[PDB]
């Protein structure tokens, strides 16, 4: 049984960009499952083989991720593949999709059936997002994002000195989460830092007025996110509208593993699936401020909440074998 992983829109070579790093970490976890796997990309190197040096059909299972040469090559490669394509649906804004003088569609048209492995539990949302796909398509839920906590070298963050009140790391996401970012992170009167690719100048929509913004700092490597989260008393979990009561995102685990107390927007998880404890949830800005002040003022509460969230994380890690079994079942092995 031979498996190939391709990133449909980004080049994979090193840990320099985020889309390249998650493909390599996905590749690492699948390898640690005891599977023979290769990443196919633009060039040959320590982590990859080139599209030109392999025969797509030598692979029994083709896994496709997403996060222009990379886009044109992957399509030509997939267009020649004669079996089912397993698409990892990890971001609502990136459903599977078919992308001029240099191109013929008989060379780029993908006719294979596609199995969408949705990171969100609500398959109707995944189906609605893939409405335009002409292909034969099937859907299945798999919590792909747990890959980080199941890696062999995973470890919780240690207690660290606090220099911030609340931290959130991420990008602007085309303004898809602007109302939520402004509500929980702007005008709080607290010491907040927003790290990642966002900038203050992007927050320009007149519908969400604000006076003072959080401090914006640059991006950091994926493997340093929990350590960065750890410099704060609390770290925020918010999501796009279609992630609510649907997607558990990577930040949930990155935060849970950190030394920062995880504070979750109520609307993201109304049933309280993540942690069945109301102390970890906030409905709005007023509640976030009060919760952060309670945590800054009672070490007994902060330590208890950290202890509880680390316990939930360890409980989940304890099921690594079942998680690995389900992933193999999802890819028909």
CB-closest chain residue to ligand UDP = 170
Q: Choose between 39 and 235: whose C-beta lies nearer to ligand UDP.
A: 235
Q: How far is the CB of 186 from ligand UDP (least distance, A)?
A: 17
Q: Is 170 a binder of ligand UDP (CB under 6 A)?
A: yes
Q: Choose between 241 and 303: whose C-beta lies nearer to ligand UDP.
A: 241
For the range 27-31, what are the long-range contacts, defined as Cβ-Cβ under 8 Å and sequence gap of 24 or more? 28/151, 29/147, 29/150, 29/151, 30/3, 30/5, 30/63, 30/327
Q: Choose between 171 and 298: whose C-beta lies nearer to ligand UDP.
A: 171
Q: Which of 254, 4, 275 is nearest to 264 (CA)?
A: 275
For 212, the token pair is: 């003072």
For the purposes of burial, counting CB atoms within 10 Å of the CB of 166, is it exposed (0-12), middle (13-18) or buried (19 or more)?
A: buried
Q: How far is the CB of 218 from ligand UDP (least distance, A)?
A: 7
Q: Choose between 196 and 214: whose C-beta lies nearer to ligand UDP.
A: 196
Contacts of 129 by beta carbon, 8 Å cutoff, 6+ apart: 89, 92, 95, 242
Q: Is 274 a binder of ligand UDP (CB under 6 A)?
A: no
Q: Is 331 a binder of ligand UDP (CB under 6 A)?
A: no
Residue selected from 13, 250, 261, 274 as contacting ligand UDP according to rule CB under 6 A: 250
Per-residue interface string for the shown chain with ligand UDP, residues 15-54, x marking contact by CB under 6 A: ---x------------------------------------
Q: How far is the CB of 252 from ligand UDP (least distance, A)?
A: 9
Strand-pairing partners, residue 85, are 62, 114
Q: Is 4 a binder of ligand UDP (CB under 6 A)?
A: no
Contacts of 163 by beta carbon, 8 Å cutoff, 6+ apart: 191, 231, 232
Q: Is 219 a binder of ligand UDP (CB under 6 A)?
A: yes
Q: Choose between 38 and 259: whose C-beta lies nearer to ligand UDP.
A: 259
For 199, the token pair is: 């900038």
* Stretch of 124-132, 184-192, 206-214, 250-258 contacting ligand UDP, by CB under 6 A: 250-258
CA 57/CA 208 separation, integer angstroms = 51
278-279-284 Cα angle (round to 5): 85
Residue selected from 120, 169, 183, 264 as contacting ligand UDP according to rule CB under 6 A: 169
Q: How far is the CB of 198 from ligand UDP (least distance, A)?
A: 8
* Stretch of 78-86, 170-178, 206-214, 299-307 contacting ligand UDP, by CB under 6 A: 170-178
Q: Choose between 81 and 89: whose C-beta lies nearer to ligand UDP.
A: 89
* Stretch of 23-31, 39-47, 246-254, 325-333 contacting ligand UDP, by CB under 6 A: 246-254
Residue selected from 14, 171, 270, 284 as contacting ligand UDP according to rule CB under 6 A: 171
Q: Given the rule CB under 6 A, which residues bind ligand UDP?
A: 18, 169-171, 173, 195-196, 219-220, 222, 225, 239, 249-251, 254
């Amino acid at each position: 049984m031979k498996i190939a992983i391709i990133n449909m829109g980004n080049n994979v070579i090193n840990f320099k960009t985020v889309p390249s790093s998650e493909t390599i970490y996905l590749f690492k976890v699948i390898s640690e499952m005891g599977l023979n796997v290769d990443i196919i990309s633009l060039k040959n190197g320590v982590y990859t083989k080139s599209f030109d040096e392999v025969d797509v059909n030598d692979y029994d299972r083709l896994i496709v991720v997403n996060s222009n040469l990379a886009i044109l090559s992957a399509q030509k490669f997939m267009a020649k593949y004669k079996s089912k394509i397993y698409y990892l649906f990890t971001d609502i804004r990136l459903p599977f999709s078919q992308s001029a003088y240099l191109y013929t569609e008989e060379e780029l048209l993908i006719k294979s059936p596609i199995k969408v492995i949705s990171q969100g539990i609500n398959l109707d949302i995944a189906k609605a997002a893939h409405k335009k796909v002409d292909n034969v398509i099937e859907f299945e839920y798999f919590p792909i994002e747990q890959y980080k906590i199941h890696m062999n070298d995973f470890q919780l963050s240690k207690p660290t000195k606090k220099t911030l009140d609340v931290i959130y790391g991420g990008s602007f996401r085309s303004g898809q989460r602007e109302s939520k970012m402004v509500e929980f992170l702007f005008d709080t009167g607290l010491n907040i830092e927003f790290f990642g690719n966002a900038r203050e100048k992007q927050f320009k929509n007149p519908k969400y007025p604000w006076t003072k913004a959080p401090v914006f700092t640059g991006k950091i490597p994926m493997n340093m996110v929990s350590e960065k989260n750890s410099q704060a008393i609390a770290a925020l979990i918010i999501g796009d509208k279609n992630y609510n009561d649907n997607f558990i995102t990577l930040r949930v685990w990155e935060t849970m593993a950190s030394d920062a107390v995880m504070l979750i927007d109520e609307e993201f998880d109304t049933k309280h699936r993540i942690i069945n404890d109301a102390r970890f949830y906030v409905n709005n800005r007023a509640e976030l401020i009060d919760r952060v002040n309670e945590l800054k003022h009672s070490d007994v509460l902060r330590k208890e909440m950290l202890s509880i969230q680390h316990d939930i994380l360890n409980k989940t890690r304890a099921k690594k074998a079942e998680w690995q079994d389900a992933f193999k079942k999802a890819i028909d092995l």
